[PDB]
């Protein structure tokens, strides 16, 4: 719920702009944290994508995360 | 008047004045320091003072040629 009160300079608009476009903040989530948070999610992946309930991969978890 | 009188504006003030006064008082004091008697109050050759008040004291501000 950003409004005119929630802008004090341009820069906020830049960060939100890229949030609309990509959603990956450079090294906000990758400060040695992306892997612990992603590891807290693969249990859902075991049924969600359902790779025959066998296995998964590593980068594809980030792909599913940006998707979510 | 404007450009008829001076090509651009110049900021003459008193600093140049008492500079010139300090010069010419030195000149007269050290002229008459050797004068044991004044024919009619002085024996000055006032052409150097012309050159000084022309080109040195007031010459600082002047950026044009014609103004010289």
């Amino acid at each position: 719920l950003m409004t005119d009160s929630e802008v004090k300079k341009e820069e906020f608009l830049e960060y939100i702009n890229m949030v609309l476009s990509t959603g990956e903040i450079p090294n906000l989530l990758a400060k040695d944290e992306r892997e612990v948070w992603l590891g807290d999610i693969s249990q859902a992946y075991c049924k969600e994508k359902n790779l025959g309930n066998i296995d998964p991969p590593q980068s594809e978890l980030w792909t599913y995360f940006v998707d979510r | 008047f404007g450009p008829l009188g001076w090509c651009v504006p110049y900021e003459y003030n008193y600093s140049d004045l008492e500079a010139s006064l300090l010069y010419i008082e030195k000149y007269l004091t050290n002229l008459m320091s050797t004068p044991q008697p004044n024919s009619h109050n002085l024996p000055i050759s006032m052409n150097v003072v012309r050159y000084m008040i022309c080109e040195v004291q007031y010459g600082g501000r002047i950026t044009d040629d014609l103004d010289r």
Binding site: - | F1, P3, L4, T63, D64, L66
Partner: protein
């Protein structure tokens, strides 16, 4: 005395305006500009112009056959046409893209908005006078009253100096972007055509005789359009109360090899702003009578070129 006059006017002109402040666009103006842009002349394509300048040229038809590069005035013709076209293209393009934002479509520019505001007011936009460093072209006050008028006159004379290709009499010095090149080209012409070698370039010096006559080739040029300030041509006298800026008669030039204080020396300023820049050349004006030259020097005479 007449100096007084101008001062008071500008003084009065601001004073009321001060108190005048204390009291409690995108319309047919762009259509007026739209009608304007179909009145300035067309471009001159260089593929045609290089041809035309190469086809015909000489100082004197008897002296030489037609030729291009070699004669200074032809290369000057090419340089002047080049800069003129450089300005013409810019004006046509920006008028277009100023009107092609509303009637046309494009994401609005700040420069174009400034251009709109300038078009409504008297002052032309900065886009046609200056650049980040400096690109002074023809800075005059009005939008079209004199600015485009001056540019039109320049292009008219330049075209007739080209399309016919014949050298006319009574050159207009104000039109040329670089007057000094005109004069030095005249020098080179005299050295080559005459006394060639008997006369060296560094030996030649300069002088002028004022054609004291109303009603009227040899070496030198005929200049039209200079303006004096504060006396007559010859038998110089005190100016009357009105008519501060007076015409200048035909000051035909003269050049001579060197050596082969009653005289007074005047400057020649392009614009009436009067700086070190715009000093094209200096002219000796012997017409003294009883008043010694220093009288005139303090009186600040000059032979300016434009009148604004």
């Amino acid at each position: 005395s007449n100096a007084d006059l101008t001062f008071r006017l500008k003084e009065s002109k601001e004073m009321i305006n001060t108190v005048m402040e204390t009291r409690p666009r995108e319309e047919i103006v762009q259509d007026k500009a739209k009608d304007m842009l179909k009145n300035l002349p067309p471009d001159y394509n260089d593929v045609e112009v290089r041809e035309l300048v190469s086809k015909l040229g000489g100082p004197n038809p008897k002296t030489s056959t037609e030729r291009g590069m070699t004669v200074p005035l032809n290369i000057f013709l090419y340089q002047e046409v080049t800069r003129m076209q450089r300005v013409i293209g810019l004006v046509r393009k920006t008028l277009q893209d100023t009107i092609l934002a509303i009637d046309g479509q494009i994401i609005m520019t700040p420069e174009i908005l400034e251009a709109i505001n300038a078009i409504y007011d008297a002052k032309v936009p900065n886009s046609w006078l200056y650049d980040p460093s400096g690109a002074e072209i023809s800075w005059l006050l009005p939008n079209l009253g004199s600015w485009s008028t001056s540019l039109s006159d320049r292009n008219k004379q330049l075209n007739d100096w080209l399309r016919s290709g014949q050298r006319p009499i009574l050159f207009w010095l104000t039109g040329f972007f670089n007057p000094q090149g005109f004069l030095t080209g005249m020098k080179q012409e005299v050295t080559r055509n005459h006394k060639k070698e008997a006369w060296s370039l560094d030996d030649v010096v300069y002088s002028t005789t004022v054609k004291e006559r109303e009603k009227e080739p040899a070496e030198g040029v005929y200049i039209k359009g200079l303006y004096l300030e504060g006396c007559k041509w010859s038998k110089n006298g005190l100016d009357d109360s009105d008519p501060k800026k007076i015409f200048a008669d035909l000051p035909i030039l003269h050049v001579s090899a060197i050596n082969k204080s009653n005289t007074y020396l005047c400057p020649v300023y392009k614009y009436p702003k009067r700086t070190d820049k715009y000093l094209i050349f200096r002219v000796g004006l012997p017409c003294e009578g009883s008043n010694n030259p220093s009288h005139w020097k303090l009186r600040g005479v000059a032979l300016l070129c434009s009148t604004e």
